Amino acid sequence: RQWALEDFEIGRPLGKGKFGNVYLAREKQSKFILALKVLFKAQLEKAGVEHQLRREVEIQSHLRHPNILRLYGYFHDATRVYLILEYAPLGTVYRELQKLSKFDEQRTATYITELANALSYCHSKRVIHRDIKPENLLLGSAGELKIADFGWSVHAPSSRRTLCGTLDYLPPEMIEGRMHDEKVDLWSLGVLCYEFLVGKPPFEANTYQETYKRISRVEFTFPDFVTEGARDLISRLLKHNPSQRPMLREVLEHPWITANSSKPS
Numbered sequence: 001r002q003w004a005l006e007d008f009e010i011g012r013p014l015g016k017g018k019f020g021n022v023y024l025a026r027e028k029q030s031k032f033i034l035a036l037k038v039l040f041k042a043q044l045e046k047a048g049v050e051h052q053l054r055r056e057v058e059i060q061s062h063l064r065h066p067n068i069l070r071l072y073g074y075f076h077d078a079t080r081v082y083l084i085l086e087y088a089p090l091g092t093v094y095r096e097l098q099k100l101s102k103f104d105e106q107r108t109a110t111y112i113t114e115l116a117n118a119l120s121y122c123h124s125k126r127v128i129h130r131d132i133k134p135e136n137l138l139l140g141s142a143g144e145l146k147i148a149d150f151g152w153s154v155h156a157p158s159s160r161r162t163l164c165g166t167l168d169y170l171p172p173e174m175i176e177g178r179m180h181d182e183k184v185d186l187w188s189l190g191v192l193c194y195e196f197l198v199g200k201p202p203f204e205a206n207t208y209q210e211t212y213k214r215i216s217r218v219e220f221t222f223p224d225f226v227t228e229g230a231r232d233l234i235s236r237l238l239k240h241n242p243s244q245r246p247m248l249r250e251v252l253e254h255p256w257i258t259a260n261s262s263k264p265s
């Protein structure tokens with residue numbers, strides 16, 4: 001229940017983040033393989049994330065889902081923060097997107113279904129992720145999608161804010177500073193589905209200021225190859241009005257999703 005660094009053997013780095021680095025690790029006692037994410041307190045303090053970390057650790061620990069990355073434990077070096085995480089052999093969706101350039105409809109539909117299932121579970125338990133991007137999505141050995149990086153996640157409805165980072169996956173309401181609900185995740189689902197098929201985010205721009213306008217205006221276009229079934233789901237998800245956005249169940253039962261999805265709703 002209480003861990004120390006000595007209990008682990010550290011391997012190659014899985015990932016780097018401004019706050020920290022993620023390492024492959026093996027628990028000595030069990031030979032269990034897992035990902036160890038290392039954060040210095042000092043980097044952490046300057047930003048007011050110390051409370052943010054507490055929210056991430058608590059929510060992820062008590063959540064159990066096939067499509068949600070598992071947090072096994074946490075401990076603190078003097079002074080470093082260590083997170084013990086499930087290890088995903090197939091890596092990030094973001095990496096997969098770079099290699100394939102774009103995802104086929106069958107693969108896209110499956111990720112959405114898995115995402116939707118995980119989100120339904122999250123929403124049921126009163127959790128909203130609020131930050132869903134391919135960099136935050138991991139792949140299981142079976143190749144199943146697993147959601148991760150719950151830091152920005154919070155209980156809703158809530159007012160938690162845009163200043164620090166890229167706006168590509170943020171809803172108009174969050175960027176505009178209006179209070180937001182679970183619908184924020186539905187918007188994210190719409191952005192991801194578009195990015196998977198097109199290979200780029202719908203509101204992507206050279207400029208932060210320009211992206212802000214695109215999101216607020218909600219002006220996006222479809223390449224010719226995107227199917228009408230795909231367009232319909234995307235258009236429904238990307239709605240300036242959160243109330244107009246469909247429920248997760250609606251997404252799961254959508255004809256395009258049902259037809260092209262390997263995994264059942």
Ligand SMILES: Nc1ncnc2c1ncn2[C@@H]1O[C@H](CO)[C@@H](O)[C@H]1O
Pocket residue numbers: 014015016017022034035037085086087088089091092135136138148149
């Ligand atoms: N368990 C893990 N397996 C593989 N990569 C991971 C894991 N946890 C975090 N990462 C990587 O480290 C980054 C920081 O969380 C992620 O965006 C991802 O690239």
